Amino acid sequence: DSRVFPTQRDLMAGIVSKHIAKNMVPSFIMKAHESGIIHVHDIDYSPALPFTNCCLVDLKGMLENGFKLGNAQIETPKSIGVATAIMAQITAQVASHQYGGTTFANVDKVLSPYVKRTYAKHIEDAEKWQIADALNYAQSKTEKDVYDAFQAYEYEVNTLFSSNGQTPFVTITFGTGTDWTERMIQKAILKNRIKGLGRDGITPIFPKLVMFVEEGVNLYKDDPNYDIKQLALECASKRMYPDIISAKNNKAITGSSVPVSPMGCRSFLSVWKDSTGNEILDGRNNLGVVTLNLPRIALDSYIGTQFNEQKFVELFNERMDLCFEALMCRISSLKGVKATVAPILYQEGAFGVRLKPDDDIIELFKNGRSSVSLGYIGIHELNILVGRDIGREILTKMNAHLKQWTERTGFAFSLYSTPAENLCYRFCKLDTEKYGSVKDVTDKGWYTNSFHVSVEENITPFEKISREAPYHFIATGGHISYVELPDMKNNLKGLEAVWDYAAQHLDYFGVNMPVDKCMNTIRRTCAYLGNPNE
Amino acid sequence: DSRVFPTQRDLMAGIVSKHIAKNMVPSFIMKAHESGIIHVHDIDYSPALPFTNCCLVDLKGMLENGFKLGNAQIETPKSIGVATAIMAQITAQVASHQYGGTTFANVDKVLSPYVKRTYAKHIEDAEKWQIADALNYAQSKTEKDVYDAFQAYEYEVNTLFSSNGQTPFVTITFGTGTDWTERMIQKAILKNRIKGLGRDGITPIFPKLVMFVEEGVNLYKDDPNYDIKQLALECASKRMYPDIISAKNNKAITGSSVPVSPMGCRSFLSVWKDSTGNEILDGRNNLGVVTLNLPRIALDSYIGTQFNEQKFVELFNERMDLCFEALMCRISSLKGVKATVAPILYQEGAFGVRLKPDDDIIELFKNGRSSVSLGYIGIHELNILVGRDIGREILTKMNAHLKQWTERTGFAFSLYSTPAENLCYRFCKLDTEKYGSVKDVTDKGWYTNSFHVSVEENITPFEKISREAPYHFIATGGHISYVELPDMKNNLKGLEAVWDYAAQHLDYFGVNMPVDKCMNTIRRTCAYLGNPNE
């Protein structure tokens, strides 16, 4: 809410920070942001404080070894219920030290050792109490211990607030686990999600659930986990989540030999290797987002009422540079900042390393370890303004710019399809104060997300999936495609159809359907789940 | 820490609030605070925001009925481990909506129904698996379920941060429970506390542990829970806590027919009844503290180098009024504030009622339900400055003023022995900028806490306890006495001696001893536990 204390204290800190940013960001960058030319995200956090954006938490390396959480020296969990309890405490802590989402990748694989542990204890207890049905007593207890554990993770995520009086934006991914412990975790999460939250079993907005689907594991009636896929479909039909990621396309796009979980909503890392040649994923992050307002480059290049191509070219080049200056300006503020700024992130392992209190954090992000995002929005409205479809082309040229940035600074710049849950209105409003109502651009009040096909089009699901799929291979830093569907609670084979089509053709995908009960109304009209009643 | 993000964001909010307070507090009150005449506590929170101070959480009325925690509608816990998990989530939430400590009173009595529940499940499971040793299988599981549950409460308290990037100031009290479930909870807490936190089993600073000791329950070798008292002694000897409260004296002082737990460190409520004649304790709170600098009234009444009695009288009367104006000024800012400001406190039961989002919260605090604190400090240094012991007398007159305030406004003003962990240095420093080094007053650098006997005196434990005990009956709004003792890990009968003496003579009491391990050094030099190494 906003009338609430934690939110109010946060707004105060936001205000002080926006003011401090005015004294740190070169005026030409602030003026372009104030006017809607670009959008420097999270200015109410950074650069006042050297926060970073989103991340894949290295939960595996923290549970295995131990780590200091506050005053306490936590030790490897002896139980699955203790490892998820700890996962929640880490979720709360990481949320409070970065301003972006937090992702726990492959919880099925990561937490499996603890499910095994729980089992060993129910067996050493099935003989300690000479229990009739031994192997069966374990199977049950363990199963219950695992459901309750994720049910409690899910509950904790929904009650625990950050340092901002907000519920954490956390993402949990699974799907590539085949072992019985890995399968049990997956089912546990899907089952508990269907059950819903609390007495009225309502639909949770967090954690976001993303499932990997790969041939020979998940998508064909013959794979080991095809039954989980079925459960996942039901879940999606009743709670919107999980979204799915195509292991096949995801690996080709990222260059990673293992599926890449999105940090936060949809920010994807590119493949990276440590000094000894190892492919690292967990513990990596993103340094921020600066979004480029694409319709506005077209609008500003109109002469009278017609488009001027030569003007577009000059402005596009001018604005790409501006964006670059904006991303570097804040990355530069990270210089000289010490690991003392966020112990959970830099010292106790969430970022997969152990820096001393006096080590500079900036060194950890260099040479491609961290990604940096150049966002964009409204290809649909840009196409309309320039007379034709330049979607794939503008993005391709943006990437060529990004490659040069990467080679000059060492940071791994990528193209990001900004979720823009609110930026979609903000850019449109600022452009409207200058151009008024422009048919099919600023007239509906918002811009279309990244490269998505406008909502006003009457596209068949497969067409939409097909018209959007190539963007998943161009905007490698972050992307997703949605399809609108009616209630499919009783048409799972239909939803599986859409899933299988998206899975083959694109990367990250999700389905928007209506999900209401005797009054708990949820819709995903943009990026997050929400009640469009308020 | 301070270099840490959550702390930094908080400092920003603190700054904005101190500035806002400058525009809300009458200048004469700010000037008296800036000069050390009085100390308006928590100005970095209130009155910028209508926060309240400390409280006794009505956990009983929240677990019994249900309540909304965020989005979720939590239901009565079916297990003890689920009720303590929930207790932690409530602890985190309440901490974020008030700026003072939070107390869970008589957790032994309150949580007992859930321990029973856990038992019923291990029995209905001892037959479901035709377990040999039935009643014995329950006894064990239940016992383990209960240890682990409080161990996890204790851990969560130490990892969970508030909206301020701080660990919550929470107090847990027990001791009057006799039932086997009540005893089990107590032992669980004492046992887990001795065990310590984390791998190195270090000493927790929170939760504070306070135990009631009453004849025919706790203190004589013949009472049911005398063995818990023994355990408590061991605990105190190894972890400083628990402190104890004399049920006998506590009830006579508070006027309550049941022992009164301190909200936060040592703030005690006076007896109060609802509209139907019921004695309410749980869900009640305190509206703030304004501390009066006693040495400074004496100092300002010196003429040249000698005390001037007539001047003292005039200043004391002038400053009491000033204090009153300071307490009312902030209570007045609570007018018109809606329950939407803190749902967990006002709507979902932590304050024992259910206000609608649009109800004013101020009505809930009136006619004695909430206490309001007039603090004071340094009787020792005041006695030195006025030539004789006026301790008991000045306090008695303060109370006569408080009674008049209570009758004119309806709020229940009480005399509070400010913990002043830092105020003790601040008042001394501000008085030193004006008077320099004054032998036995401002020369050591700090003032002595409330009515405590100076540390520089060489008093026997019983003497100290005896010289201080009468203050517990005068400063009813908050008080405590400490005794310094050597290592008593191997002299428990000695510590029990001190305990029994304090128990008979005063109210709330604690013992400071050294508590170190292969380097985890803890001391309570003032109010809280801490490492005097930094």
Task: Please give the full DSSP string across A21-56, using - where no structure is assigned.
Answer: HHTTS-HHHHHHHHTTSEEETTTTTTTTS-----EE
**Is residue B79 helix, strand or coil?**
coil
A117-146 residues labelled b (16+ CB within 10 A) or e (exposed): bbbebbbebbeebebeeeeebbbebbbebb
Q: Which of A533, A511, A388, A385 is nearest to A447 (CA)?
A: A385
How far is residue A322's CA from residue B312's CA, in Å, rounded to a whole number? 68
The three-state secondary structure class of B150 is: helix
* Single-letter amino acid code for the residue at A217: V
Cβ separation A71–B341 shorter than 8 A: no
What does DSSP say about strands A38-40 and A286-293: parallel, antiparallel, or unpaired? antiparallel
Interface contacts (A, B; CB < 8 Å): 174
Identity at B34, one-letter amino acid code: E
Among residues A507, A56, A481, A55, the alpha carbon closest in space to that of A252 is found at A507
Cα torsion for A426, A431, A432, A437, to the nearest 10°?
Answer: -120
Element of type H or E holding A193: helix A180-195
- Interstrand relation of B371-377 and B302-303 (parallel, antiparallel or unpaired): unpaired
| Cβ pair B163, B201 in contact under 8 A | no
- Report chain B residues whose CB lies below 8 A from the CB of A137: 129
The Cα–Cα gap between B8 and A524 comes to 34
* Residue A245 bridge partners (DSSP): A212, A508
- Residue partners of A199: CB distance under 8 A and separation at least 6: B66, B73, B74, B75
What is the SS3 string spanning A133-173? Answer: CHHHHHHHHHHHHHHHHHHHHHHHHHHCCCCCCCCCCEEEE
Q: Note whether B5 contacts A97, CB cutoff 8 Å.
A: yes
Q: B112 in helix, strand or coil? A: helix
| Tokens coding B239 | 């972890």
Mention every residue, 6+ apart, whose C-beta is less than 8 A from residue A253: A268, A472, A473, A476, A507
**Contact criterion met (CB below 8 Å) for A229 and A497:** no
Binding site for Zn(2+), residues of A?
Answer: 518
Cα–Cα distance between A56 and A103 in angstroms, integer?
5
How close, in Å, is residue B150 to chain A by CA atoms?
Answer: 13
Which of A299, A261, A256 shows the shortest CA–CA distance to A278?
A: A256
How far is the C-alpha of A463 from the C-alpha of A481, rounded, in Å? 12
CA A426 to chain centre: 21
Contacts of A277 (CB under 8 A, 6+ apart): none
Q: Would you call B493 exposed, middle or buried from its count of C-beta atoms within 10 A (0-12, 13-18, 19+)?
A: exposed
CA atoms lying within 13 Å on the CB side of residue A111? 33
- Three-state DSSP class for B364? helix
What 3-state class would DSSP assign to B197? Answer: strand
Residues of chain B with C-beta less than 8 angstroms from the C-beta of A343: 1, 4
B469 DSSP assignment = G
Cβ within 8 Å, pair B199-A89: no
Compute the C-alpha angle A117/A216/A273, nearest 5°.
Answer: 70
When CB atoms are compared, the residue of A13, A93, A131 closest to B131 is A131
Tell the residue number behind the tokens 């009024």, with chain if given.
B321
Residues whose CB is less than 8 angstroms from the CB of residue B3 and which lie 6 or more positions away in sequence, other chains included? A338, A340, A341
Quick one: which of A192, A195, A235, A179 has its CA closest to A211?
Answer: A235
Closest Cα in chain B to A4: B341
Q: What's at A378, amino acid-wise?
A: G
List of chain B residues whose C-beta atoms are within 8 Å of the C-beta of residue A93:
159, 161
Expressed in Å, this structure's resolution amounts to 2.5
Structure tokens at B211: 């135990």
Angle of CA points B127, B131, B135, to nearest 5°: 80
Q: Are A241 and A208 in contact (CB under 8 A)?
A: yes
How many domains are contained in chain A?
Answer: 1
Distance, in Å, from the CA atom of B106 to the CA atom of B210, rounded to the nearest integer, reads: 9
Q: Is B59 helix (H, G, I), strand (E, B) or coil?
A: helix
CB B204, CB B196: distance < 8 Å: yes
Question: Is B42 annotated for ligand binding?
Answer: yes
Cβ B377 vs Cβ B383: under 8 Å: no
Contacts of B192 by beta carbon, 8 Å cutoff, 6+ apart: B147, B150, B151, B154
Question: Per the annotation, where are the binding residues of A for dTTP?
Answer: 75, 89, 121
Judge whether B246 and B207 are in contact, CB under 8 Å.
Answer: no
Q: Distance (Å, rounded) from C-alpha A500 to C-alpha A220?
A: 9
* Cα distance between residue A411 and residue A399, in whole Å: 14
Beta strands in A282-421 (DSSP E): 286-293, 302-303, 306-307, 371-377, 412-416
**Element of type H or E holding B21:** helix B5-22
In sequence order, the β-bridge partners of residue A373 are A289, A414
Nearest-CA distance B132 → chain A (Å) = 7
Is residue A212 classed exposed, middle or buried when 0-12, 13-18 and 19+ CB atoms within 10 A define those classes?
Answer: buried
Do the beta carbons of residue B517 and residue B201 sit within 8 Å? Answer: yes
Asked if residues A242 and A209 have their Cβ atoms less than 8 Å apart, the reply is: yes
The Cα–Cα gap between B209 and B242 comes to 5
Please name the residue ranges forming H helices in B390-491: 391-409, 423-435, 461-468
SS (H, E, C) A281-305: CCCCEEEEEEEEEHHHHHHCCEECC
The CB density around residue B398, as the number of other CB atoms within 10 Å, is 21
Residue pair A523/A203 in contact by the 8 Å Cβ criterion: no
Structure tokens at B134: 């039935």
Separation CA A380–CA A451 (nearest Å):
7
Other Cβ atoms closer than 10 A to A164: 21
> For residue B235, what are the domain limits?
1-534
Torsion sign (Cα): B337, B338, B339, B340? negative
Question: Strand, helix or coil at A358?
Answer: coil
Q: What b/e sequence results for B425-441 when a residue is b if at least 16 CB atoms lie within 10 Å of its CB, and e otherwise?
A: eebbebbbeeeeebeeb
Report the distance separating Cα B364 and Cα B121, nearest Å.
40
Task: Specify whether the CB–CB gap between B66 and B348 falls below 8 A.
Answer: no
Q: How far apart are CA A60 and CA A62, in angstroms?
A: 5
Contact assignment for B163 to A5 by CB distance below 8 Å: yes
Query: In Å, how far from its chain's centre is CA A127?
Result: 45
- Alpha-carbon A216 to chain mean position: 26
Cβ neighbours of B125 (radius 10 Å): 17
Known binder of ligand: residue B393?
no
Please report, as a single letter, which amino acid is at residue B203. Answer: T
Cα(A42)–Cα(A326) distance, integer angstroms: 13
Q: With b meaning 16 or more CB within 10 Å and e meaning fewer, what string describes B169-203?
A: bbbbbbbbbbeebbbbbbbbbbbbbeebbbeeebb
CA B18 – CA B13 distance, rounded (Å): 9
Q: Is B303 exposed, middle or buried (0-12, 13-18, 19+ CB in 10 A)?
A: exposed
Contact present, B108 and B174 (Cβ < 8 Å): yes
Interface contact flag, A165 B89, Cβ < 8 Å: no
| Cβ A56 vs Cβ A284: under 8 Å | yes
Residue located via tokens 């596009």: A316
DSSP state of B373: E
Give the residue on A whose Cα is nearest the Cα of B196. A72
- DSSP conformation class of A351: T
Helix axis angle for B309-333 and B391-409, nearest 10°, is 40
Rounded to an integer, what distance in angstroms lies between the CA atom of residue A146 and that of residue B354?
36
Q: How far is A137 from chain B (nearest CA, A)?
A: 8
Q: How far is CA B4 from CA A336, B8, B419, in A?
A: 15, 6, 26
* CA gap A414, A402 in Å, rounded: 6
CA–CA min distance A448, chain B (Å): 30
Is B421 annotated to bind a ligand? Reply is yes
CATH number for the domain spanning A50: value is 3.20.70.20
SS3 state at A83: helix
Q: What DSSP element (H or E) covers B510?
A: strand B508-512
Q: Give yes or no for a contact between A374 and A402, defined as CB atoms under 8 angstroms apart.
A: yes
Q: How far apart are CA A442 and CA B447, in angstroms?
A: 67
Report how far residue A142's alpha carbon sits from residue A119's, in angstroms, rounded to the nearest whole number: 6
H/E/C letters for each residue in A443-491?
CCCCCCCCCCCCCCCCCCHHHHHHHHHHHHHCCCCECCEEEECCCCCCC
A20 vs B218: CA distance, rounded Å: 58
Distance from CA of A358 to the nearest CA of B (A): 12
Cis preceding-peptide flag for B207 (omega within 30 of 0): yes
Pairing of strands B306-307, B243-246: unpaired
Distance from CA of B12 to the nearest CA of A (A): 5
Q: Are the beta carbons of A455 and A461 closer than 8 angstroms?
A: no
Dihedral pair phi/psi, residue B57, rounded to 5°: -75, 140
For residue B372, what are the β-bridge partners? B413
Interior angle at CA B300, CA B294 and CA B303, nearest 5 = 135
Compute the distance between CA of residue A342 and CA of residue A344 in angstroms, rounded to an integer. Answer: 6
Contact B209, B200 (CB under 8 A): no
Measured distance CA(B523)–CA(B203) in Å, rounded: 10
First-to-last alpha carbon distance for chain B, in angstroms, is: 12
Q: Which residues pair with A481 in a beta bridge?
A: A509
Q: How far apart are CA B138 and CA B126, in angstroms?
A: 7
* Residue B213 contacts residue B174 (beta carbons within 8 Å): no
Rounded distance, CA A150 to CA A363, Å? 36
Element of type H or E holding B498: helix B492-505
**Best B133, B160, B531 residue to mutate vs chain A (most A CBs within 10 Å):** B160
> Tokens at residue B334, please?
């609570």
In one letter, which amino acid is B135? Answer: L
Cα–Cα distance between B63 and B80 in angstroms, integer? 11
Q: First-to-last CA distance in chain A?
A: 12
- Which residues in chain A have Cβ-Cβ distances shorter than 8 Å to B12? 12-13, 16-17, 48
For strands A508-512 and A243-246, give the pairing: antiparallel
Residues of chain B with Cβ-Cβ distance to A165 below 8 Å are 96, 163
Q: Could you say which of B16, B89, B129 has the minimum Cβ distance to residue A160? A: B89
Residue type for A84, please? Answer: T
Q: What residues contact A34, with CB distance under 8 A and at least 6 apart? A: none
Nearest to B207 by CA among B189, B231, B185: B189
Do B304 and B19 contact (CB within 8 A), yes or no?
no
**A333 within 8 A of A24, measured Cβ to Cβ:** yes
d(CA A21, CA A19): 5
Answer positive or negative: Cα dihedral of A364, A368, A371, A372: positive
User: Measured between alpha carbons, how far is B31 from B24 in angstroms, rounded to an integer?
Assistant: 13
State the Cα–Cα distance between residues A488 and A240, nearest whole angstrom: 11
Q: Cβ contacts (< 8 Å) between A82 and chain B: which residues? A: 152
Nearest to B110 by CA among B22, B23, B174, B31: B174
Kindly report the number of other CB atoms within 10 A of residue B107's CB atom. 27
Q: Is B409 helix (H, G, I), strand (E, B) or coil?
A: helix
Strand A55-56 with A302-303, pairing:
unpaired
Q: Are the C-beta atoms of residues A144 and A81 closer than 8 Å to each other? A: no
Please give the residue of chain A at the shortest CA–CA distance from B19: A12
Q: Which positions ≥6 away from B524 have C-beta within 8 Å?
A: B240, B482, B510, B512, B530
Q: How far apart are CA A160 and CA A224, in angstroms?
A: 36
Q: How far apart are CA A415 and CA A61, in angstroms?
A: 29
- Run of H or E residues at B210: strand B208-213
